RNA sequence: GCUGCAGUUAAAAAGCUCGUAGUUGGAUCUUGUGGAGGGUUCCCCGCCCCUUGCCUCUCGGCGCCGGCCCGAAGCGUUUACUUUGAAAAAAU
C-alpha cells in the first residue's frame with residue numbers, strides 16, 4: 001500500500017543512524033523527499049546524497065554524518081498559520097537553540113525560521129534535530 | 130554488515146547474485162538466442178524462457194520444449210546468445 | 214558552548230568516537246584510546262610522533278571496532294592501500 | 297535548397313548558410329546519393345569550449361531525425377574533414393511549452409502533451425548528443441552547495457568514437473540548458 | 487499481497503533500462519502491425535499475441551518497436567473485442583464453477599471460491615464502468631452471464 | 637606498512653606455508669569475511685597472507701607505542717599457547733598469564749593478582765573470553781589471533797591465522813616478537829634472528 | 844488519552860472470510876543571469892521560447908515629429924490552504 005512515501009523514507013534514515021551506518025539507500029524517491037533532504041543538508045545534519053535513476057520512481061543514497069539525532073513526520077499534513085507555530089515548536093522541538101521544523105509554504109519547502117522571516121504559514125511535513 | 134559498506138558502487142558479481150528486482154537497477158535474467166535446426170537451415174531467433182513450441186519452418190516441426198523455467202532445445206545445434 | 218559575551222561556560226568538552234561521531238560519556242567503561250606508532254619511513258624504526266584513536270563502547274560491543282580501526286588506519290597511510 | 301532550407305530560421309545567416317551551402321553541395325554531388333534525398337535543416341551555431349575548441353550544432357527538424365540517424369557517421373566525418381579542426385553534433389529541434397497552470401497565463405488552448413514538457417525535451421537532447429553510445433545509466437549527485445551534477449553512463453562498446461568528442465558534450469549541454477554533465481564508461485558491462 | 491489469498495510473492499517481470507530496439511531486428515514497425523493483425527484475425531487476445539511475438543520473433547516489447555500498446559493497435563483498426571479479456575476470463579471461470587456447483591451441491595469450497603470470483607468480477611466492472619468502457623446499465627447476472635461468454 | 641622495508645619477504649611466506657598458518661576452519665563468521673581468499677574444493681577456507689601480515693604489523697605498531705614494556709600483559713589459557721606467551725614475555729618484557737585466569741584480576745582492588753595493564757594480547761577470543769569480558773570494564777584495548785570462526789566481540793586488532801595447530805600458534809607469537817623488537821630499535825633489519833621459532837612451539841609430550 | 848492511554852499473561856482482538864457506505868491512497872508535467880533591497884553564486888524590473896500578457900477595438904485624458912504608441916474591457920480551468928484589507932454593541 002504505502003500511503004505515505006516521506007514517512008518511510010524518514011523512518012529508514014532514522015533506523016540506520018541508531019546503528020552507526022555510513023550510508024543508506026531509500027526508495028522510492030519523490031520531489032518532497034529531495035527538498036526535505038536538501039533542507040536537512042543545508043544545515044549540516046547529513047552529507048551529500050546521490051539519486052539513482054531507474055526508469056521508475058528511483059532510489060536515493062544518503063551519506064550519513066553522526067550528527068543527526070532524530071528526524072520524523074507529522075502524519076496528517078495540518079495547516080499551520082504563523083500563530084500556531086510557537087505552540088507547534090514547543091511540542092516537537094527539544095530546545096530553543098537548535099532543531100528545525102519543516103513546512104511547505106506557497107514559496108517552497110522550508111523551515112520555520114525562514115517562514116517567520118518571510119511571513120508565511122503552510123502545511124507541516126516533519127522535523128529534525 | 131561491515132557497518133561501512135558501499136551501496137553506490139556495488140560488486141560486479143554480488144550485483145548478479147541478487148534478485149532481478151532487488152538489485153540497484155532492474156535487469157532481466159533472460160536473453161534471446163540464434164538456434165540452428167540440423168536439418169532445414171535458417172536462423173530462428175528464440176526467447177530463452179520460451180514457454181511456446183517453436184517449429185523452424187516445416188522440417189523438424191519442433192525446436193524447443195516449454196518447462197517451468199528455461200526452455201530446452203531438442204538437438205538444436207550451435208545456439209548463440211544474441212547481444213545488446 | 215559559549216554565551217553572548219563570548220566566554221566558554223562548560224565543565225569540559227567530551228571526546229567523540231572516531232567511527233560513529235557520537236560523544237563518549239563519563240561512565241563508558243568500555244571505550245578505549247588505542248594509540249599506534251609511526252615509523253621513520255626509511256629504516257622502519259619508531260620515532261616519537263604517533264596516532265591516536267577513540268572507539269565508543271557500543272560499536273565495540275557489536276564487534277565492529279576491528280573493521281573500524283582498519284578503516285581509520287587505511288584512510289591515513291599507516292596502511293596506504295591494497296590491504 | 298540552400299537559401300530556403302532554414303524555414304522559420306530567418307534564412308539569411310552568415311555562418312548558418314555557410315554550413316548550409318557546403319552541406320547541400322556535397323549532398324548534390326553524385327558521390328553517394330542512396331543515403332540522402334536533400335533533407336531540410338533549420339539552424340546551426342558554433343560554440344566555444346572550456347578546452348578552447350570549436351563545436352558546431354546542426355539543428356535538424358524532428359520528423360527528419362530517424363533518417364539522419366540512419367547515417368550519422370559518413371555525414372559527420374565529411375563535414376568534419378571539410379571544417380577540419382572542429383567538432384560536429386546534431387540535435388533534433390523540439391519545443392518547450394510553459395506550464396499550463398502557471399508559467400504563462402492560460403487561455404484554454406490545449407492539454408500540453410508530455411513530449412513538449414521541459415524534462416522530456418531536456419532528455420531527448422542528451423539522447424541525441426551522444427547517439428552512437430546508447431545511454432545506459434544515469435545518476436545525479438547533489439553536492440554541498442545546492443548545485444547538482446549529472447553523470448551519464450555509456451556502453452563500453454562504441455567507446456573509441458565518442459571519448460575524443462566527450463569533452464564537447466559538456467560544453468554543448470552547459471550552453472543549451474545550463475547543467476554540469478559528466479560522461480563515464482562504467483565499472484564493467486553487467 | 488494477494489487480493490483474495492493469504493500469500494504474497496513477487497513473480498513479476500522486469501523489462502530493461504536500455505529502452506531502444508535491439509540493433510539486430512528481422513522486422514520494422516508496419517511489418518509488426520501486419521503480423522499483429524494476422525494473429526488478431528484468428529481469435530487471439532493481446533496477451534497471446536505478445537507471447538507469440540516474443541517467443542518466435544525478435545520483438546521483446548511491441549511498444550518499443552511500434553509506439554502503441556497492442557490493444558490500442560487493435561482498436562485503431564476495429565478489431566478489439568466488445569469486452570476486455572480481464573472481465574471475459576473471469577466470467578468464463580465463474581460459469582465453469584457454477585456448472586460444477588449445479589452438478590454436486592455438497593461442495594462448499596466451490597461455493598466459497600465462486601463468491602470470491604464474483605467479488606472480483608464486480609470490483610472490475612465497477613472500474614470499467616467509470617472509464618466509460620462499459621455501459622452504465624451493465625450488470626453481471628448469472629444467466630445472462632453464461633450467455634455473455636458465448 | 638605501505639613501504640618496502642616492512643613488506644613481506646620470500647623467506648617468511650615459506651615459514652607460513654610450512655607451519656600451515658593459511659589453513660582456516662570449516663565455518664566462517666560474517667566479521668572475518670574480509671580476511672578469506674576463497675573456500676577450498678573440500679569445505680575449508682584459505683586465509684589471505686598479505687592481510688595477516690598487515691594486521692600483525694598493526695599489532696606491533698600498537699605494542700611499540702606503549703612506553704613501559706611491562707603493562708602489555710599477554711594471556712594464554714589453552715595448552716598450545718603457554719610456552720609461546722612465556723617466551724614472548726621473556727623476549728620483550730611483558731607479563732604473561734598461562735593457565736587459569738581467576739576472574740576479577742582486572743576489576744578487584746583486594747586480590748594479590750590484581751593488575752592494571754595498558755594492552756592485552758590473547759591467543760584465541762573464543763577460549764579466553766574471560767579476559768575480554770573483564771577488559772570490557774576498565775577501558776582495556778585488545779589484540780587477538782583469530783581463526784576463521786572467531787567472534788570478534790571486544791577485540792580491537794584481530795590477526796587472522798590458523799589458531800588450532802601448535803606450529804601455527806608458536807610461529808605467530810615468534811613473528812610478533814621479531815617485529816616489535818625490530819621497530820623498537822634493538823635487533824635491526826637486514827639480519828636473520830638468533831632465536832628459531834621452535835623455542836615457541838608446544839611440547840606435545842616427547843619420547 | 845486530538846496533543847496523549849491501553850488489548851500474550853493484570854480488564855481487553857468479533858471463530859473465520861467477503862463486502863456497500865465511511866476513512867486512507869504510489870511516481871511523474873520549466874531554468875541561469877544584466878540592474879536593483881540582504882551575502883561575494885543565492886533569495887522587484889527583464890533577456891536563450893515566456894516571463895503580469897494575449898488581445899479588440901473604443902470612447903472619454905496622456906506622449907511626439909493629418910500620421911506614429913501603452914495603461915484602461917476579458918481574465919490567468921476552478922477550489923481547499925496561506926498572507927492581507929473591509930465589516931462586525933457596550934460591559935467583562
Ligand SMILES: [Mg+2]
Pocket residue numbers: 487494
Ligand atoms: Mg509485497
Ligand SMILES: [Mg+2]
Pocket residue numbers: 497498
Ligand atoms: Mg506469477
Ligand SMILES: [Mg+2]
Pocket residue numbers: 498
Ligand atoms: Mg501484473
Ligand SMILES: [Mg+2]
Pocket residue numbers: 848849
Ligand atoms: Mg490506563
Ligand SMILES: [Mg+2]
Pocket residue numbers: none
Ligand atoms: Mg486470569
Ligand SMILES: [Mg+2]
Pocket residue numbers: none
Ligand atoms: Mg485476561
Ligand SMILES: [Mg+2]
Pocket residue numbers: none
Ligand atoms: Mg483471532
Ligand SMILES: [Mg+2]
Pocket residue numbers: none
Ligand atoms: Mg500524490
